[PDB]
């Protein structure tokens, strides 16, 4: 089948190499996963040595980490916006190792309020009252309240990040390998890397 051998290539000087044996199993290749976005469909392929590789044909939920806040949450992927390898991979909405994707920011919003107690992602407020009126006040005691404003002076979010929290979607880069591990973990873009990819998306269409 698909072969990963080096003997079918031309040698460095450009001469032709004659194979001295037929194809061997240990130098095989399998068809690409071509992971899509959708309901979870993960296939198991048995690999060298009796081990197990998880083919991830479709994912919809991933485990992405904020990083700057050490907050990792299991969130839902919306779509793929940029891919450094091929522009077609974005068009077919395929999840690869390094493509950047939009993820739902609700779990990070929930952690932010339950940790910082400052409105993030909100536009004008007084709209989800049955819970937000309780998280902000909590009628807490002297020390806990004193424990919350010591979490306030370091409480600040970059303008680029907080703007995306208004939109409800954060763009993040995958760090795992769907089609090998069967999962789509990654990290949220911040800083210069976030600015670099925003410029690339803007140059793509803007």
């Amino acid at each position: 089948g698909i072969s990963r051998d080096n003997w079918h290539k031309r040698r460095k000087t450009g001469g032709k190499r004659k194979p001295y044996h037929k194809k061997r199993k240990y130098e095989l290749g399998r068809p690409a996963a071509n992971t899509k976005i959708g309901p979870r469909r993960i296939h198991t392929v048995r690999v060298r040595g009796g081990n197990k590789k998880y083919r991830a044909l479709r994912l919809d939920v991933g485990n992405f980490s904020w990083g700057s806040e050490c907050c990792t949450r299991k969130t839902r992927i919306i779509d793929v916006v940029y891919n450094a390898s091929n522009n077609e991979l974005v068009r077919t909405k395929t999840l690869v190792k390094n493509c950047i994707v939009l993820i739902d920011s609700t779990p990070y919003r929930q952690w932010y309020e339950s940790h910082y107690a400052l409105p993030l992602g909100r536009k004008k407020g007084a709209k989800l009252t049955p819970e937000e009126e309780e998280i902000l006040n909590k009628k807490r005691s002297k020390k806990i309240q004193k424990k919350y404003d010591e979490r306030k002076k370091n409480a600040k979010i970059s303008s680029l990040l907080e703007e995306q929290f208004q939109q409800g979607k954060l763009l993040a880069c995958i760090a795992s390998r769907p089609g090998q591990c069967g999962r789509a973990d990654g990290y949220v873009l911040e800083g210069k890397e976030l600015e670099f990819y925003l410029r690339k998306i803007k140059a793509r269409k803007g």
Binding site: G67, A84, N154, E190, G191, E193
Partner: protein, 153 residues
């Protein structure tokens, strides 16, 4: 130009740029840390790689490559590829019948890290064996010595 001249974003994977820069620290300029390692075997990491800004995953000092195996030298021949040069090694092959030697050479394509900015054609370079970097590249440049120059008229 800068280090972002392509379709992806370069960064040393061991470095976190976004270390929660808030009002307690002046922003900026918080100079990002640089990953660098001593490659061992007595070789001294160049100062350019200690404090430069280039990104090279195949660099012996600022990349994810380990030098192990044979250490050998050569002469730079061409420098018309990106981050990699070809060196020529001259040796003598002994022939028993004629009790005489025979001059032979082998060209080797080696990876040249951007830390060695001052590299011309004809210099002596010591290379160390690493994992296969390309189809025909298995050695990485460790030290550059000038070829009876260091002064240019």
């Amino acid at each position: 130009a800068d280090i972002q001249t392509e379709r992806a974003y370069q960064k040393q994977p061991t470095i976190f740029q976004n270390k929660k820069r808030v009002l307690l620290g002046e922003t900026g300029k918080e100079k990002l840390p640089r990953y660098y390692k001593n490659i061992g075997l007595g070789f001294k990491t160049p100062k350019e790689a200690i404090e430069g800004t280039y990104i090279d995953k195949k660099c012996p000092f600022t990349g994810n490559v380990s030098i192990r195996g044979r250490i050998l030298s050569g002469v730079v021949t061409k420098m018309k590829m990106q981050r990699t040069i070809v060196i020529r090694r001259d040796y003598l092959h002994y022939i028993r019948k004629y009790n005489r030697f025979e001059k032979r050479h082998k060209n080797m394509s080696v990876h040249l890290s951007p830390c060695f900015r001052d590299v011309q054609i004809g210099d002596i370079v010591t290379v160390g064996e690493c994992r296969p970097l390309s189809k025909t590249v298995r050695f990485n440049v460790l030290k550059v010595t000038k070829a009876a120059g260091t002064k240019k008229q």
